[PDB]
Ligand binder design. Structure first.
Ligand code: HEM
Ligand code: NPO
Length: 137
């Protein structure tokens, strides 16, 4: 289930982080805008860049901490608040997050693997709702 999926992702965090983020950027290419140093680079080119891997790992690390502190896929209001208040997120809406979680849920379905995709779908919805509540537009 959802706890096991956190263990699976954490187990190979850099590979899942890159694979899922790239699925996100390729599914929603206008999102590439917020990431000026990833513009005009192939998946392969990006996976060779230390800093691409480092930033995606830090994002998915924090995402896995928020997932782990959640109860029945409902995140803490304080985790939501952390995500709205970070300077790096100051020009984002809930739609940016929605799209990430649509990409994460589609990756999992398309994976060979028994991910609890419906739980990640629900976690994404709950987090987008909590982010709104904490004042993100
Ligand atoms: C659960 C979802 C997300 C989490 C946990 C998260 C977490 C983080 C973290 C930890 C950083 C700092 C990275 C570092 O210093 O290396 C960061 C930066 C950033 N995040 Fe997010 N983020 C999320 C979603 C998004 C989304 C959906 C967008 C845009 C569509 C976004 C845009 C950015 C940008 C532009 C930065 C700064 C530049 C960069 O580090 O690449 N984030 N985020
Ligand atoms: O998935 N994301 O939103 C990300 C991914 C990588 C990054 O450096 C910043 C944000």
């Amino acid at each position: 289930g959802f706890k096991q999926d956190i263990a699976t992702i954490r187990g190979d965090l850099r590979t899942y982080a890159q694979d899922i983020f790239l699925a996100f950027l390729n599914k929603y290419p206008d999102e590439r805008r917020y990431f000026k140093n990833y513009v005009g680079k192939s998946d392969q080119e990006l996976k060779s860049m230390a800093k691409f891997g480092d930033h995606t790992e830090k994002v998915f690390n924090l995402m896995m901490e928020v997932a782990d502190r959640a109860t029945d896929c409902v995140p803490l209001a304080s985790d939501a608040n952390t995500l709205v208040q970070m300077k790096q997120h100051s020009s984002l809406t809930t739609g940016n997050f929605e799209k990430l979680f649509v990409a994460l849920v589609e990756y999992m379905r398309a994976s060979g693997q028994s991910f609890d995709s419906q739980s990640w779908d629900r976690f994404g919805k709950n987090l987008v709702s909590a982010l709104s509540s904490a004042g993100m537009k």
